[PDB]
Design a protein around this ligand. Structure first.
Ligand SMILES: NS(=O)(=O)c1c(F)c(F)c(S(=O)(=O)CCO)c(F)c1F
Ligand SMILES: [Zn+2]
Length: 260
């Protein structure tokens, strides 16, 4: 189905109707139970080379905002941690809920955060395209960053300044010179597990790298993402007030930690 969303009749619970992998064995997001998580000394240092001129556009997909990056070069790449080879930056988006008390996709020892930032990368060492890589178990790597309610994050301004211009699904605007690096928290300690896209088609192609340390967002900043529409110009307006999928069962998978 081309009309999945987060409303009552198209939301997460209904996605299994058209995407039965929703009930798969490597579905994301998940709950992270820290007492069960083992530190893995075989994890290499996480290496993050990001070039601000890589960013090209921001658009409203109807499901989030998407910052798209020029990904035919290795100017912005994620290496190390659990990864074999170079994963090229593709895009950035965000998940939130209708209220500040929850809205993260991953939930850590019962704790949810206000929002969760995802940085999507694809294995250009093996696959010809993001689209192809999305269908391979080792094709994608997504870095998740929790956002907790806190004093305002000046590093979100480039993004929040654009939201009016992309109110309607399908809108896009020029977006370059984007300091993605500064959106990350100081500490890059993370958990990692094999999982999926958190959005249809829910492909089980993602090495998840979920950072332990949250960054801040104010309640005022976060409210602005909720006045995005999930509807296109000329369609009955509906607001994108929540766009997060619930944690799915581990089903035997084990979460590893970069740190002890
Ligand atoms: N929540 S998630 O990180 O799993 C995620 C997205 F939500 C997402 F929209 C994309 S996409 O790049 O925009 C198109 C493939 O779905 C992704 F590639 C992707 F990985
Ligand atoms: Zn996401």
């Amino acid at each position: 189905r081309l009309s999945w969303g987060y409303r009552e009749h198209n939301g997460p619970i209904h996605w299994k109707e058209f995407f039965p992998i929703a009930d798969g064995d490597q579905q994301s997001p998940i709950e992270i139970k820290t007492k069960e998580v083992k530190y893995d000394s075989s994890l290499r240092p996480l290496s993050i080379k990001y070039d601000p001129s890589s960013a090209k556009i921001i658009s409203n997909s109807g499901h989030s905002f998407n910052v798209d990056f020029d990904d035919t070069e290795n100017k912005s790449v994620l290496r190390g941690g659990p990864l074999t080879g170079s994963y090229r930056l593709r895009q950035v988006h965000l998940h939130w809920g209708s209220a500040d008390d929850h809205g993260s996709e991953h939930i850590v020892d019962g704790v949810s955060y206000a929002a969760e930032l995802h940085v999507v990368h694809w294995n250009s060492d093996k696959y010809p395209s993001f689209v192809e890589a999305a269908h391979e178990p080792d094709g994608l790597a997504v870095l998740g960053v929790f956002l907790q309610i806190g004093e305002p994050n000046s590093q979100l301004q480039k993004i929040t300044d654009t939201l009016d211009s992309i109110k309607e699904k399908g809108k896009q605007t020029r977006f370059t010179n984007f300091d993605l690096l500064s959106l990350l928290p100081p500490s890059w300690d993370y958990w990692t597990y094999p999982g999926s896209l958190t959005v249809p088609p829910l492909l089980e192609s993602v090495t998840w790298i979920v950072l332990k340390q949250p960054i801040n967002i104010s309640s005022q900043q976060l409210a602005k993402f909720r006045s995005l529409l999930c509807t296109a110009e000329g369609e009955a307006a509906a607001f994108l007030v929540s766009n997060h999928r619930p944690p799915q069962p581990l089903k035997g998978r084990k979460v590893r930690a970069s740190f002890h």
